[PDB]
Design a binder for these strands. Structure first.
Ligand SMILES: [Mg+2]
Ligand SMILES: [Zn+2]
Ligand SMILES: [Zn+2]
Ligand SMILES: [Zn+2]
Ligand SMILES: [Zn+2]
Ligand SMILES: [Zn+2]
Lengths: 576, 525, 49, 44, 93, 98, 82, 67, 115, 257, 87
RNA sequence: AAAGACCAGGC
DNA sequence: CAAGTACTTACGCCTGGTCATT
């Protein structure tokens, strides 16, 4: 009927007006390219040779456009249409058309997209304004899109069959709008949390952790190779931190060149012991923590997520605030290029050797698990003889479940601590956990020590069968194996009951992921549609569509959230 | 023991499963009788006397690996993986590529991928013997290196050896079938398979018709490119209107088999199969048997690939960062078992709950062959020649190619077709359609404060339109532009008319409202 | 005659029942092909439980 | 125009608009007998 | 804090707790065309038709629907040519 | 034609009542891989609507042990509702209880 | 409002800069005279940015205060953020 | 389907070593000994012969299109 | 479908040049050699040979993009010794070394076979 | 400021393997020689296939690719065969290609194995490594396979069919003395074939004044170029590339200066 | 195109008065026939009224010069025998 | 060929 | 003025095949 056409999604108002299908847009699978700058998008020659941008044939570029016309549509750096002033369009694809190639001022030539053209790159679950960023086209062979890895985080991307959308602005005005508003370097720091969105992620972060130790000394040739990749290098080779015996540079010394300008920063590495700041060696750091960057030189410290990542006060954040968007873009690209080309020498891996511990630690983990099992058996026996008083606020059964969960979680925590403390300083799992590139302590604990309690609906594996979790158990077996504790670690392999319990836990997670999406998306739409038209007027008062004063000053102070940062009052706390 | 003895002689003894069941040995238990059944997972550990847990077992399980279904039994060492990775593999195995049926030559089916050189896994599960996975493999064993070589494998991507793909690695054929049916619909309206001449059919397309034979069908072997005509066909209009079948855009295949028959109604019926050899490029998708999925980031040549002291350059390099968070360990143990099996010469066992295949046992067996017990190998950089200071974990892992190829996903749009109703770009890649600028995109752009780009996307890029609106009443006015006689019936106005540029979608919205008696007046004063 | 019931492939009523591998290959059917699908208007249809 | 029968494989010369019928085989499926024009396969 | 502040204000500004839902986003004194994009469409348009409600086209969804430059950033100001500054300086063409 | 239509279109019932009829039964056997053919021939479909937000009907019940694969289930909004048989599972064909 | 009593931000906002650059670039592409000397640049956006830095754009931004009054600010008066 | 000539990882011809592999396995030897007797020292080459499936025998059972 | 032809890494098409020399203005007597249709095989050996020269203060090479086929070699020498001279001398030295190695290997094969 | 003086000794020289050690040379030059082994050594490989009849179960592109990977003995005529890109004639000529013909129809009940012995060439020197036989296809009764091919000269950069070598085993510093790879636990790594250390000790002591030299090789042919020819032609090609680069650089310097 | 290009500053909704509907309608007497076409050609007063819009993808309508792109589609009207509620 | 429904799938 | 009822809404994008009706 007439009403069903004008309805919600797939209707008219939302399916054809507030959102509509657009021209000059392409899509293909994205694929990593660490060589491309942060503000570049790798575009195949087919997408470029199809998408066209109209350029007014000014007398400055009548020659270049005439050559593009002469190329035709076959040659890639060519053109498809000539739009003469009266609106008539002459098509270059069909026949050479030798009398229609004439160009004068005021005509338009629909040239194929070339390197440097500003495009808007989109990942369809567009949640924040850092999800549609302006890139610069670079044409690369093969038929995939290619974007830098630090741009993976803002898009929430991952190159596993992922696809992105490439919108090409067509007028000069919209090109300038995207260039001055939504380029990647300008959107390093989001106003959502006054933190950077893009950080050194994945391989380059792990190699930065390995490259910024006191261990790493670089010879002359490796220094030359690394310094070739700095786009911001002034051409001066720094004097090595080690001279006569054999000129050897240091990883931090080369990283000092990457750091833009005169940036000051103080951070703490992940493995920074708590007592160093209070004890001596506060400024000496035996473990080489406490990153201190002074005058743009990395004086000391191991760089990890806590300094080169998307946290407040990170070195990338300080770079954006102090230096600017252009220099910070150069910083990102240089870090990636130089650190990847050093990682070619150093290398990184993961394997079975990193998921196996010493026999002593296996013994300690097994003993802790058995002690926890004996404790839970004792608690079951105590509850069966009615020697357990009901904790205030909980019934007896909930008190027993809390006791069992406490014992098993304490066991998992202690076993994981033992496994973590048993990792070799060369361990790849530990390298990635300390680097923060990909991993967590619980992941090491599960792959080495114990997988842990498996929970469904927040409680232990529920009694699906009649008073028994599986047919293989006796009724009313509340012991750790029966109700969901997976004693075996991932490497040790899980017994069938533990396998089914892990299937139940993982399935719970999957169901949550697949069922929360509708509610979250609907909530986002309601939020946007509630305040879509609310803006800061030129009198610095925040007003809605009916000029109703919402906030007298935006955010009660009148300052945008990209520039603010955390500071300490230094007068609120101290005594009189 | 007698039952197993007669089953080992299953041939020439006429002892089957039904004899085993009829002898009172095995019993079917349904779900609600399983409640009143106490089950022993394995005999050798539960029946025997120990510190007793249950002394009243009523049934025992044949092997606990039968809980897993058909697609999840191909997972090697699935008990070591995180369960969501097993689910991802279960989904991915159906999308793997291989010989789907041994008589694909006769069946003319749409979207038929046939892999070139399938290999049966070197780390196999016993269940795979009954799924016939050995007889129709979907995948191939690749010398997988877990290394971070040049950053083109970061996130989930992989680095595929160009030389391997050069020698036939993962190469596949994509058979696509096109079906056309002659029919008699009207009295004088007749469809017929015949080659259209240049001037006999009123409807024509810029395609090339020279490949069609006298019958209107291309003979096999003809190298048909995109837009080329496959089955010549035209309808006698009440002189003729062509209705021949073109190819999909950017295919560039070769005809395999062209078939003529009669359909149910007795008309002439044609089915044409075109094969396109799809060499693995750097947009294609590859997945392990453990949920480790990724696009081929880049295709380095053999010299560029790192090499062992022996000369084994990895065919696929996967990211070390993929593993630790998702805790896929069947991949690592499967690489170890693949190395030990390829060296030893047998096909290793990856049955889930075996308790006689430990990591340490595989490691010792690997150390017995001159390799590192953990599977590591000292690797040399192919560019500079230097040893890589960190030893790379190299092992033969079963990787399977997926149906998701980039040449079946890449689309570009620049002023193509429009829908009949909305006058906006069509929906889809096949209809030369355009990407959608949904509501979330416009919310993002508003957040940017980008009014002009938003207007271009939602006005100029899509349907642009011009209407004439009366000034006295906002109802659109009759506008004869060539005669320049702009008249608004309803107030007899002929002079006070203004031109409004609005999207055609908004014009349709206003007219649809007018057909519901609502008058959306567009007043410009 | 009152109708035509579709016959599941490799059912007791299919013409492929009880045939050896050589016979099926003479009929251009794959011996490994499980069966269990109907053929309706040329397409293969599987009835989900 | 010669078509190869799908069962007996004996090539039959079937004219246009004639019913698709294999002589001496009684089979209604026929095939097409690849063209004599020759295309080049780069062995890459 | 400013994002939470703006949400909490856009609720508790009109004097009553305004839920971020069809009852409160479509209850305010906005235009029919802004309400018509959020969960009611034909109902809002019918009400506006009945009571002769007028949309002044001040919001963003309104101008997006008509394909006009919405008063967002790069839309909240109008540029004008400056005649005096065209003479001053060098001008080649 | 009733049997043919119901098997072909997938809407289980009379043609005139397509909207009220069950859909998604009698799918097309996907023949990309042999494992896909087998998984399609051995598949179970919970008739509950895929748009339900209740987690319980999608969770892996304990009673699926040995009857339904604990792992194989399509991601997305059809998770836990389209299931696949375990290797040993057999579905009773029927017997008159005389 | 009049030329006097301009109560607004002396700084040029990012949206104002974006739109002034776009409009000036289109004017330059449409054979408009270029106020600053050009060192052989043929990109209208690049010429526009050169003019903006030199503060020689013939554009007055009309900022509409919410009460309906407008303030006209020449591009040369505003201080560029970059 | 057919034996892959030119082992992927390195390049050694393993396309003439399949019939000999089958004969050797059929006669006496274990798989490892048969692979050694064919001079496939590197395990990448061994993965070709060892893990191959000779589907061309299944394909050849079907009657040809033309006789 | 957007595959570069396989002969796009060594074959020079019509118009582009094998070698180009550009002076780097930041630092004195330091030039930049862009070699087209060449890869690490030549760049690494050139860099290593250059680093043998005592009068070379900086010598490095890089491939700007693996999908592209181009080498950039930066050569900075001591004054009174040009980077062009360093490049040509290093190439001649590599030529001489390869000639010596080929003669020695021919001696080795003649000695090994029936010797 | 001059070149080093490499000394080569050959340990093993068989019909399919040369195992040689090159001393007093840098690491980059050894690696470059190794890469020219794989990449830049010319060879004759089938790169044009025209199929008149193919009734095999393997389709035309399949058999074309199988033909391409068939090694063809290009021991002698490769140096005297000009590239098709650089030849005067269009298509193919006897100085730019070698013509092969295959024509096998299976009439017997037992399967007919179409193998490399059925590739009939015209140049007696280029024979598909048949002084077993590489299997092309298998045919049943009535199936037919006839094709005409031209083999060109190329190297491994263009395609791996021209790659002359199976595994080129390159190794230096077998007893880890330059610490170029820090073994995490030294004791558990197998000693190299060229290890010169005692069993009890794990790695050689660190040599801070050292640099890589004495690079060990194992050049394994694919039956096309004998290993000595592979290595000699590799040094020849590398020297030719550097000579051409020097010619271009001298031309550029003269043009600019 | 002689009319000025004027942007919309206000949308005033309202209910189409019957007199407004009859005057704006390009069909005289109302649509009185159910047949879309009668002889293979659009029938005046049918649902496919040639005056109501531009059809056949090349032609031009009666009301203006259609071209199928210029013509916005002109409204018709049906005179109900007895009035009826608007749902 | 067209839009309608369904199905399967990708992120 | 309570107790009763009915109505409207429930992520974004993208890919393919199938079928009935026109
Ligand atoms: Mg993803
Ligand atoms: Zn009017
Ligand atoms: Zn016949
Ligand atoms: Zn090999
Ligand atoms: Zn020639
Ligand atoms: Zn009209």
């Amino acid at each position: 009927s007439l009403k069903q056409r004008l309805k919600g999604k797939e209707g008219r108002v939302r399916g054809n007006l507030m959102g509509k299908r657009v021209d000059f847009s392409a899509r293909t699978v994205i694929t990593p390219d660490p060589n491309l700058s942060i503000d570049q998008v790798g575009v195949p020659r087919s997408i470029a040779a199809n998408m066209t941008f109209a350029e007014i044939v000014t007398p400055f570029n009548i020659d270049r456009l005439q050559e593009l016309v002469r190329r035709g549509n076959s040659q890639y750096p060519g053109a498809k249409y000539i739009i003469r002033d009266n609106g008539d369009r002459i098509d270059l694809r069909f026949h050479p058309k030798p009398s229609d190639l004439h160009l004068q001022t005021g005509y338009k030539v629909e040239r194929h997209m070339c390197d440097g053209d500003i495009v808007i790159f989109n990942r369809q679950p567009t949640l924040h304004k850092m999800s549609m960023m302006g890139h610069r086209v670079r044409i690369l062979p093969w038929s995939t899109f290619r974007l830098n890895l630090s741009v993976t985080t803002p898009y929430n991307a991952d190159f596993d069959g992922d696809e992105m959308n490439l919108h090409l602005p067509q007028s000069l005005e919209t090109r300038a709008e995207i260039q001055e508003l939504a380029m990647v370097p300008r959107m390093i720091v989001t106003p959502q949390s006054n933190r950077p969105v893009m950080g050194i992620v994945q391989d380059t972060l792990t190699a930065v952790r390995k490259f910024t130790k006191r261990d790493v000394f670089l010879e002359r040739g490796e220094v030359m190779n690394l310094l070739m990749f700095l786009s911001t290098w002034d051409g001066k080779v720094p004097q090595p931190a080690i001279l006569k015996p054999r000129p050897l540079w240091t990883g931090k010394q080369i990283f000092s060149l990457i750091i833009p300008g005169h940036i000051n920063c103080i951070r703490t590495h992940s493995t920074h012991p708590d007592d160093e700041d209070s004890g001596p060696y506060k400024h000496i750091s035996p473990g080489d923590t406490k990153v201190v960057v002074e005058n743009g030189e990395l004086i000391m410290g191991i760089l990890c997520k806590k300094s080169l990542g998307t946290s407040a006060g990170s070195l990338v954040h300080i770079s954006y605030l102090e230096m600017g968007h252009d220099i910070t873009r150069l910083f990102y690209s240089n870090i990636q290029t130089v650190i990847n080309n050093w990682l070619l020498i150093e290398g990184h891996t993961i394997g079975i050797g990193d998921s196996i511990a010493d026999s002593k630690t296996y013994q300690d983990i097994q003993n802790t698990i058995k002690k926890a099992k004996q404790d839970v058996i004792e608690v079951i026996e105590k509850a069966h003889n009615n020697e357990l008083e009901p904790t205030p606020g909980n019934t007896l059964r909930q008190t027993f479940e809390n006791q069992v969960n406490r014992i098993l979680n304490d066991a998992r925590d202690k076993t994981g601590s033992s496994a973590q403390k048993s990792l070799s300083e060369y361990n790849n799992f530990k390298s990635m956990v300390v680097s923060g590139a990909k991993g967590s302590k619980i992941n090491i604990s599960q792959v080495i020590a114990v997988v842990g309690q498996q929970n469904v609906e927040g409680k232990r594996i529920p009694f699906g069968f009649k008073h028994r979790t599986l047919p293989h158990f006796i009724k009313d077996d509340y012991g750790p194996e029966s109700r969901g504790f997976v004693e075996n670690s991932y490497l040790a392999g899980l017994t069938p009951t533990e396998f089914f319990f892990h299937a139940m836990g993982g399935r719970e997670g999957l169901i949550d992921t697949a069922v929360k999406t509708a509610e979250t998306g609907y909530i986002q739409r309601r939020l946007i549609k509630s305040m879509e038209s609310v803006m800061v007027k030129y009198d610095a008062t925040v007003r809605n569509s009916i000029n109703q004063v919402v906030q007298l000053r935006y955010g009660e102070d009148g300052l945008a959230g990209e520039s603010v940062e955390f500071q300490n009052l230094a007068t609120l706390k101290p005594s009189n | 023991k007698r039952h197993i003895d007669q089953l080992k002689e299953r041939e020439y003894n006429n002892y089957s499963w039904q004899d085993l069941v009829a002898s009172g040995v095995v019993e079917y238990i349904d779900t609600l009788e399983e409640e009143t059944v106490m089950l022993a997972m394995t005999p050798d550990d539960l029946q025997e006397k120990e510190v007793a847990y249950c002394s009243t077992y009523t049934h025992c399980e044949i092997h606990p690996s039968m809980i897993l279904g058909v697609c999840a039994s191909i997972i090697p060492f699935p008990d070591h993986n995180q369960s969501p990775r097993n689910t991802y593999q279960s989904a991915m195995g159906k999308q793997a590529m291989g010989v789907y049926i041994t008589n694909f030559h006769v069946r003319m089916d749409t979207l038929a991928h046939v892999l070139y050189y399938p290999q049966k896994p070197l780390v196999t599960t016993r269940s795979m013997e009954y799924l016939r996975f050995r007889e129709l493999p979907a995948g191939i064993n690749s010398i997988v290196a877990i290394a971070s070589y040049t950053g083109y494998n970061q996130e989930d991507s992989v680095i595929m050896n160009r030389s391997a793909v050069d020698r036939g690695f993962f190469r596949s054929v994509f058979y696509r079938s096109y079906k056309e049916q002659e029919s008699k619909k009207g009295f004088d309206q007749e469809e017929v398979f015949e080659k259209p001449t240049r001037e006999t059919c009123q409807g024509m397309r810029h395609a090339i018709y020279d490949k069609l034979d006298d019958d209107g069908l291309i003979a096999p072997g003809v190298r048909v490119s995109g837009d080329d005509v496959i089955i010549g066909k035209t309808v006698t209009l009440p002189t003729k209107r062509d209705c021949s079948t073109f190819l999909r855009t950017s295919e560039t295949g070769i005809v395999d088999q062209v078939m003529v028959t009669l359909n149910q109604e007795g008309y002439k019926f044609c089915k044409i199969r075109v094969r396109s050899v799809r060499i693995p490029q750097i947009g294609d998708k590859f997945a392990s048997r453990h949920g480790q999925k990724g696009t081929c980031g880049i295709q380095y040549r053999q010299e560029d690939m790192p090499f062992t002291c022996e000369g084994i350059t990895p065919d696929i390099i996967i990211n070390p960062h993929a593993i630790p968070s998702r805790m896929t360990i069947g991949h690592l143990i499967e690489c170890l078992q693949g190395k030990v099996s390829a060296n030893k010469g047998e096909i290793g066992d990856a049955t889930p709950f075996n308790d006689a295949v430990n990591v340490q046992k595989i490691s010792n067996l690997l150390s017995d062959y001159g390799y590192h017990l953990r599977g590591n190998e000292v690797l040399y950089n192919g560019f500079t020649g230097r040893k890589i200071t960190s030893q790379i974990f190299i092992g033969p892992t079963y990787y399977q190619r997926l149906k998701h190829m980039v040449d079946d996903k890449i689309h570009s749009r620049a002023r193509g077709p429009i829908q009949i109703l909305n006058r906006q770009p069509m929906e889809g890649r096949s209809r030369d359609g355009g990407l959608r600028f949904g509501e979330m995109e416009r919310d993002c752009q508003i957040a940017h404060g980008a009014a002009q780009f938003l207007r271009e996307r939602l006005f100029e890029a899509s349907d642009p339109y011009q209407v004439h609106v009366c000034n006295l009443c906002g109802i659109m006015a009759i506008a004869n532009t060539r005669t320049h006689t702009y008249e608004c019936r309803g107030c007899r106005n002929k002079t006070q008319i203004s031109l409004v540029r609005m999207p055609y979608a908004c014009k349709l919205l206003f007219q649809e409202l007018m057909s519901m008696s609502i008058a959306p007046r567009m007043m410009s004063v | 005659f009152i109708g035509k019931i579709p016959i599941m492939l490799r059912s007791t009523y299919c013409l492929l029942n009880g045939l050896t591998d050589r016979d099926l290959c003479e009929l251009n059917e794959c011996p490994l092909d499980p069966g269990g699908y109907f053929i309706i208007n040329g397409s293969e249809k599987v009835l989900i439980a | 125009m010669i078509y190869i029968c799908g069962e007996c494989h004996t090539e039959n010369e079937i004219k246009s608009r004639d019913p698709i019928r294999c002589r001496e085989c009684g089979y209604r499926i026929m095939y097409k007998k690849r063209t004599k024009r020759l295309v080049v396969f780069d062995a890459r | 804090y400013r994002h939470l502040a703006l949400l909490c204000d856009t609720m508790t500004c009109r004097g009553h707790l305004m839920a971020i839902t069809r009852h409160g986003v479509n209850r305010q004194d906005t235009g029919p065309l802004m309400k018509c994009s959020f969960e009611e469409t034909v109902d809002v348009l019918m009400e506006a038709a009945a009571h002769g409600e007028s949309d002044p086209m001040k919001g963003v969804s309104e101008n997006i629907m008509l394909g006009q430059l919405a008063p967002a950033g790069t839309g909240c100001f109008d540029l004008l040519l400056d005649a005096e500054k065209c003479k001053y300086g060098m001008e080649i063409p | 034609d009733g049997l043919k239509y119901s098997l072909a279109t997938g809407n289980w019932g009379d043609q005139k009542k397509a909207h009220q009829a069950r859909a998604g039964v009698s799918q097309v056997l996907n023949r990309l891989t042999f494992a896909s053919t087998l998984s399609h021939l051995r598949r179970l479909n919970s008739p509950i609507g895929r748009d339900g937000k209740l987690a319980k009907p999608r969770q892996l019940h304990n009673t699926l042990w040995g009857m339904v694969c604990p792992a194989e289930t399509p991601e997305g909004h059809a998770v836990g509702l389209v299931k696949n048989l375990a290797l040993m599972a057999y579905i009773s064909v029927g017997s008159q209880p005389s | 409002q009049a030329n006097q009593k301009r109560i607004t931000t002396p700084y040029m906002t990012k949206y104002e800069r974006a739109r002034v650059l776009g409009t000036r670039a289109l004017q330059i592409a449409m054979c408009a005279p270029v106020m600053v000397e050009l060192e052989g640049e043929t990109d209208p956006l690049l010429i526009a940015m050169k003019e903006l830095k030199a503060r020689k754009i013939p554009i007055i931004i009309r900022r509409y205060l919410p009460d309906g009054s407008y303030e006209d600010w020449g591009v040369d008066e505003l201080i560029i953020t970059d | 389907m057919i034996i892959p000539v030119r082992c992927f990882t390195c390049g050694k011809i393993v396309g003439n070593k399949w019939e000999a592999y089958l004969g050797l396995l059929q006669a006496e030897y274990t798989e490892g000994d048969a692979l050694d007797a064919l001079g496939l020292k590197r395990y990448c080459c061994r993965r070709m012969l060892l893990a191959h499936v000779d589907l061309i025998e299944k394909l050849l059972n079907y009657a040809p299109l033309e006789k | 479908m957007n595959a570069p032809p396989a002969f796009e890494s060594f074959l020079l098409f019509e118009g582009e040049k094998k070698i180009t020399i550009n002076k780097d203005t930041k630092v004195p007597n330091a030039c930049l050699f862009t070699i087209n249709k060449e890869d690490h095989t030549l760049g690494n050996i050139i860099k290593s040979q250059l680093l043998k020269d005592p009068q070379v203060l900086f010598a490095g090479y890089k491939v700007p993009h693996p999908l592209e086929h181009k080498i950039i070699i930066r050569v900075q020498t001591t004054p009174d010794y040009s980077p062009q001279e360093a490049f040509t001398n290093a190439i001649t030295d590599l030529i001489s070394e390869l000639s010596l190695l080929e003669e020695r290997f021919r001696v080795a094969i003649k000695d090994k076979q029936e010797g | 400021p001059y070149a080093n003086q490499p000394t080569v000794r050959i340990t093993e020289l068989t019909d399919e393997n040369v195992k040689f050690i090159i001393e007093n040379t840098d690491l980059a030059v050894a690696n470059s020689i190794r890469r020219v082994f794989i990449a830049e050594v010319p060879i004759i490989a089938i790169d044009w296939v025209q199929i008149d009849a193919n009734s095999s179960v393997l389709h035309d592109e399949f058999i074309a690719h199988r033909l391409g990977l068939i090694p063809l003995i290009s021991d002698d005529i490769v140096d005297k065969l000009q590239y098709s890109r650089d030849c005067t004639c269009e298509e193919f000529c006897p100085e730019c290609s070698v013509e092969f013909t295959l024509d096998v129809r299976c009439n017997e009940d037992q399967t007919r194995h179409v193998t490399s012995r059925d590739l009939i060439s015209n140049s007696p020197r280029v024979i598909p490594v048949t002084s077993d036989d590489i299997l092309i296809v298998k045919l049943r009764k009535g199936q037919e396979l006839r094709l005409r091919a031209y083999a060109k000269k190329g190297f491994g950069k263009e395609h791996a069919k021209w790659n002359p070598t199976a595994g080129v085993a390159f190794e230096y510093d077998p007893d880890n003395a330059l610490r170029h790879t820090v073994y995490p636990k030294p004791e558990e790594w197998p000693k190299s074939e060229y290890s010169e250390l005692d069993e009890d000790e794990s790695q050689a002591p660190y040599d801070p004044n050292g640099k890589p030299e004495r690079f060990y090789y194992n050049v394994e042919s694919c039956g096309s170029l004998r290993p000595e020819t592979i290595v000699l032609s590799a040094l020849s090609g590398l020297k030719k590339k550097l000579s051409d680069l020097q010619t271009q650089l001298s031309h550029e310097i003269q043009s600019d200066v | 195109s002689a009319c000025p290009l004027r942007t919309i500053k206000r949308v005033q909704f309202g209910v189409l008065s019957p007199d407004e509907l009859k005057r704006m309608s390009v069909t005289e007497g109302g649509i009185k026939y159910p047949e879309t076409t009668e002889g293979g050609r659009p029938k005046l007063g049918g649902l496919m009224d040639p005056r109501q819009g531009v059809i056949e993808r090349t032609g031009r309508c009666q009301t203006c010069a259609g071209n199928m792109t210029e013509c916005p589609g002109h409204f018709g009207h049906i005179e109900l025998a007895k009035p009826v509620f608007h749902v």
